[PDB]
Amino acid sequence: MTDRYSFSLTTFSPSGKLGQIDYALTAVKQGVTSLGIKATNGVVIATEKKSSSPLAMSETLSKVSLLTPDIGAVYSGMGPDYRVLVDKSRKVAHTSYKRIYGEYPPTKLLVSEVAKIMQEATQSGGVRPFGVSLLIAGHDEFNGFSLYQVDPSGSYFPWKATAIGKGSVAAKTFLEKRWNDELELEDAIHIALLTLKESVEGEFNGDTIELAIIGDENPDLLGYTGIPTDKGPRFRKLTSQEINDRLEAL
Amino acid sequence: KMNGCSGADVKGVCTEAGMYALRERRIHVTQEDFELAVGKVMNKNQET
Amino acid sequence: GYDRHITIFSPEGRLYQVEYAFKATNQTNINSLAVRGKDCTVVISQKKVPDKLLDPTTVSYIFCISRTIGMVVNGPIPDARNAALRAKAEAAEFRYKYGYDMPCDVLAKRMANLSQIYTQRAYMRPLGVILTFVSVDEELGPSIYKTDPAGYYVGYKATATGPKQQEITTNLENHFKKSKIDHINEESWEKVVEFAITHMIDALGTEFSKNDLEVGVATKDKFFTLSAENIEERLVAIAEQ
């Protein structure tokens, strides 16, 4: 008969490549269009939120979470698939690093540990890997700014500008269309708004659009003063009221 | 300028080279038409 | 087919097991309404009236998790009672380890991630019931979190469950645009029950009696369900307006 839809849990794919990954990438393609732009002085990520019912509160859905103050993340796919992954991903960064080195996890170690959970889901039978794709953007002292595309197959690669979701193929050219590596962060946000606007024309406001940036530390989000050594959070989530300010200036 | 063009691909590069000559109202295919024919047929066969 | 019996991904990305989860929620044909007031939250569930051989007091679609917190479930009964036992266990354990009340935002998140744990188990069947959590938060105030059997929860201005949910959402959407607020007036919690039932009858198009409905009320630091005499008292006050 046809294939049994194996992750290589108990069975290797006879076709030479796993067929359900493309069906898991179909669940990735099922997700909203989410993009990111890696520049020299900062990294910006943009994504759209599903409206669903008109009475659903838009502030409840957060498609950009906080792992470490210097590293942001954005995802496209099923809702509960991202929560179970990150709830376990946080405990990995705490025990394997923060309970040992007692600092904030860098960009190289944190992204690698997130992909290891997907590797265990593919290896351990009976547990289906989650079909969400995560775009992790962060800034550390060692490697600096970084933008990585985490695939459900367990592979990650750096990208200057990349997109996931239904517009993964379409917006990838659109990001390369208006943006180049020589551009800075300020001109990158305007490009991210123009590219994400082409995804849906219904509502471009901050209610259904969640925009976040990575950049210079903000002392207002540090929560304390008096210590010059400890750096402030490099990730600042843009309020929906502030998102409309960038729309009028777009 | 091309890569691995078989007998079927060479005929199209020559056919497309004559296509620009019709827009030029010329009975001859200019050398500039070949430069646009290579960058076209190679990208034309790659699509789909 | 074998592809329809598996919990894992389908060829088209549409899970057949999840489609039966939402399909089983409409098997009982129960229409419930959950709205948010100003200082209070009132949720009313449709109470099916069986013959005289069943106790209507024992029959309930709303379970009490804790004070100020309440849950209404529409779907398969055997998965409805077991889902309430899991929400109560996590509510008491969270008030011990962390020593703080468990909000419906987290209370809908625990059952949502727990449903994904059931999908990872081959012998265990996931919950096919809808979990609607309502309470009055100390900060955010009234909040509604409705957990789909697939583990989807998001805040709502007004929500319902049933085949008429599309008609209920449309009727309540235009009403919220006139006042430009998602909260019901008459801050007194006694009058909030009047409007919550009034907007439900106009949305459903059918008037119900005291035995046809079960009115839950979640107040500040208190939660209770109106009995047959209290629901009948509400219908008398609603009839005069």
Added chain:
Amino acid sequence: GSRRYDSRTTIFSPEGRLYQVEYALESISHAGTAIGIMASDGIVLAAERKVTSTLLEQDTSTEKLYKLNDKIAVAVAGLTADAEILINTARIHAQNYLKTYNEDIPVEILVRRLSDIKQGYTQHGGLRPFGVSFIYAGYDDRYGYQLYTSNPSGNYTGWKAISVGANTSAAQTLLQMDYKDDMKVDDAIELALKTLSKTTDSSALTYDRLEFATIRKGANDGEVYQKIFKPQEIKDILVKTGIT
């Protein structure tokens, strides 16, 4: 024949060879071609990358070449999910030898034990075998430089020059004709770039898609030193060899 059981590795095939090993060779050919070269004064490692995307940053990421220790640098070809599991396990086991014996592990000792790790999944348990193609490069004081390969069957074979991935038989034939018994380090670099140029669809042989690592014994005080050149230095050796 007609009924073929692909499920468990414990199920024997009618021919006697597991069909999951056959199809694992196809997955290796789908990736980039990696050619290891064992020389007298060191080991030259060269490979090409499968990703052609310009938006991807190739200079900051290494898909194939990895470093197990100071004396061993390996290049993995296969599934990325299975690579990070086996490489990290190899790094743990290699340091465990340094824990007990306070010494660096020889190549033959590490390669032989890593081969049985893949076989352990096929020998017992319903888990998956990891189709992987490594490149085993290192030096010890016993047999000297040892260049081994990793087949999906979980074995190892001695190779002086070997090519894996796409164009396996095409690149290996070019190496056997120009092979030198001495295998000079400078000649090994020219031999690698000459073979990779014919097996790569790109005629210019861009530097950003290449991974170049070199082991040399001619360092200071006669010590083995592994240095992976930056892509800017990869473009420099392309002009010296006459590729560009």
Added chain:
Amino acid sequence: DVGGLDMQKQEIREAVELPLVQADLYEQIGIDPPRGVLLYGPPGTGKTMLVKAVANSTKAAFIRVNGSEFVHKYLGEGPRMVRDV
């Protein structure tokens, strides 16, 4: 009769009107005229009703051979009918 076809209409004339009328110009170029053209897109827009109007200007016989036609359980008539056309 339908606007917005300037992208397609410009491509139709060269691949239809020229080889059926002006094809003598291709002999001055030295190449054979194109023997066909491929269409890619959802049917109903510049596909069904458009090709019937093109046969009017060319004054040529319009024959409908589809992908779901000549489909039957009998064997041997499939290749026989295509050769007769």
Added chain:
Amino acid sequence: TSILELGQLYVTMGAKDKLREFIPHSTEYMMQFAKSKTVKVLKTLIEKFEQVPDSLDDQIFVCEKSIEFAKREKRVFLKHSLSIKLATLHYQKKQYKDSLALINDLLREFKKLDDKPSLVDVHLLESKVYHKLRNLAKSKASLTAARTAANSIYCPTQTVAELDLMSGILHCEDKDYKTAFSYFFESFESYHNLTTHNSYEKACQVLKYMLLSKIMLNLIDDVKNILNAKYTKETYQSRGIDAMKAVAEAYNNRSLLDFNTALKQYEKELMGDELTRSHFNALYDTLLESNLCKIIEPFECVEISHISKIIGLDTQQVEGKLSQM
């Protein structure tokens, strides 16, 4: 850095007479400031002449002067920047001989040897060279190479929207006005969003082509809805704008009296456009043909003196135009 900002203000205050001599004095800065890179300064000073209205003599005198100084060492690679602005001034000069002679030799060096997006900027000016030349073979070819490269290279809003305008102009002589006017209305939405970047004269001319395109298609309701309705008008009124309504009303009744009535009154903005006057004689023969078909419908062999009274023109004018047909 201030001189770039000060250079824009000199034309505003009337210092452009002093500014034309200040630009060639910037050669000494290129040996120090910004480590050569003559594109940041000299090209910006000429760019200020396009945004702010400037005389034609001051623009050509500087463009043909500052290039001949020692800056040519950096202008070997940057010659594409000054060559585009030089051919632009030749358009207002109405002499394409100096521009066309350069373009023919420069097209060989401009393909992926210097600047990729600079092609359409050259093909756009090249299309205007053959347009005034009345050559439709090279004009449609130069635009085709620019429209084909639109997917490869990229151009700003002003350049992309101009490619559609130049496309619709090519459909003026080839008729087929059913699909022709779409290029004119599509570009106007791009120029309207330019706000400060768009001037009054740039958007006023675009409306003259959109109104003229609808008149060729001969729709009375669509022409009146543009000028009368303030939503479709966007507050644009001039002599050439109101003249299109009088011509549209003249075609409704088909009378040559009101056709030439607005000719003499609006002749300032009506006869200033060569494309409008080219279509003016097209309607002059169109409205006359409608009047000529009125005398031909009954039986012929009538008096010529009665023919001029029915049409409403002079005897010599009727005999001259009728014999031409």
Added chain:
Amino acid sequence: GEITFDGIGGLTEQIRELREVIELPLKNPEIFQRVGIKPPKGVLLYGPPGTGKTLLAKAVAATIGANFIFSPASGIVDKYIGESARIIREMFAYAKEHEPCIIFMDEVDAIGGRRFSEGTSADREIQRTLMELLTQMDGFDNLGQTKIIMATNRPDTLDPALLRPGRLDRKVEIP
């Protein structure tokens, strides 16, 4: 017809819209000529099996006065060799001879389906039927005095090639 308008009662809102697109163009074609819209060819009446399929079929021919033509889809697709084109061609010939006629069908879900590429695998009688129904209305000779009616459960069981404009312009749901 046979069944009167009493049994189809309750659909009057959809019945008046059905008469304007069927009864009006068959009697006075000048209605849509002044408007500028082309008359719809196919009209799909779908609902529960046996509910509203028989009542709405015989009611259209009774109110208009045209003859009642019932051509069930179960009489076309077979495992027997042949029986594909000859039924639709002769059905088109019968409606061509007698103008006041209206064709009705039943059980369209059995002859439908989109497969994947609209090819044929064991579809030999299925695909030849779906393509022939499209060539009759959009061909050189259509039925101006005869409207094609199909009866099924859900429109999802019909070939998307027949769902495009020019073939089926109307979908009426039977509650």
Added chain:
Amino acid sequence: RDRRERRLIFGTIASKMSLAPEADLDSLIIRNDSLSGAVIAAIMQEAGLRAVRKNRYVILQSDLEEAYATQVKTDNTVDKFDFYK
């Protein structure tokens, strides 16, 4: 597609139909995005079906708005609840 580019389709079919002077043809090219010529043809025909429903032979502005409300469904999906995630 584009707002002003689709006018060659919407406007061409509008020329073959009877319209009112108050009918707004710009509302069809704003909200609609990327429609095939077949789907667009059903929009103008639906406006005529709303005119005969009101017993009018001239399409008004309200008929163009009622025709769009039926055509809001283009791709095949269940209501607005599609794209489960």
